[PDB]
């Protein structure tokens, strides 16, 4: 985009976890699709195992990430539980008109 100033499209292929309501099981319409999603792992937890498996991170780094997950999960649950308890001249002169009337004949050389 910065090199050619042209639109770029990124198609992110993922999956919808739940229907469009609390009591919506779209397995009525797409049973095969939702049978796969039933046995899927979260795109955050799966990536966590991949970094351990590839030797990118250790079990100490797995604890640094798991403590950060709870530290950010508790962060919003407690902040919300605490914040819940605390609840004109519209005309011009003729000389201006004569400037606009002359601009139509102020043609370039």
């Amino acid at each position: 985009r910065q090199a050619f100033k042209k639109d770029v499209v990124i198609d992110m292929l993922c999956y919808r976890r739940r229907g469009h309501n609390e009591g919506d099981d779209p397995s009525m319409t797409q049973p095969y699709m939702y049978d796969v999603i039933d046995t899927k792992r979260g795109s955050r937890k799966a990536y966590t195992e991949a970094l351990i498996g590839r030797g990118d991170i250790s079990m100490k780094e797995a604890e640094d990430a798991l403590r950060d997950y709870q530290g950010q999960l508790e962060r919003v649950f407690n902040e919300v539980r605490e914040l819940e308890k605390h609840e004109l001249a519209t005309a011009v002169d003729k000389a201006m008109l004569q400037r606009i009337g002359d601009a139509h004949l102020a043609l370039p050389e």
């Binding site: 792992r41 937890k45 351990i52 997950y69």
Partner: peptide, 30 residues
């Protein structure tokens, strides 16, 4: 790689052995 399967049995049979921070990660595995 290793504790993806190993600490899952150390927590399901005895949850006191596995660190209390891995309980909110090993439950969502199986």
């Amino acid at each position: 790689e290793w504790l993806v399967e190993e600490m899952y049995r150390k927590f399901r049979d005895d949850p006191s052995s596995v660190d209390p921070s891995w309980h909110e990660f090993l439950v969502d595995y199986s």
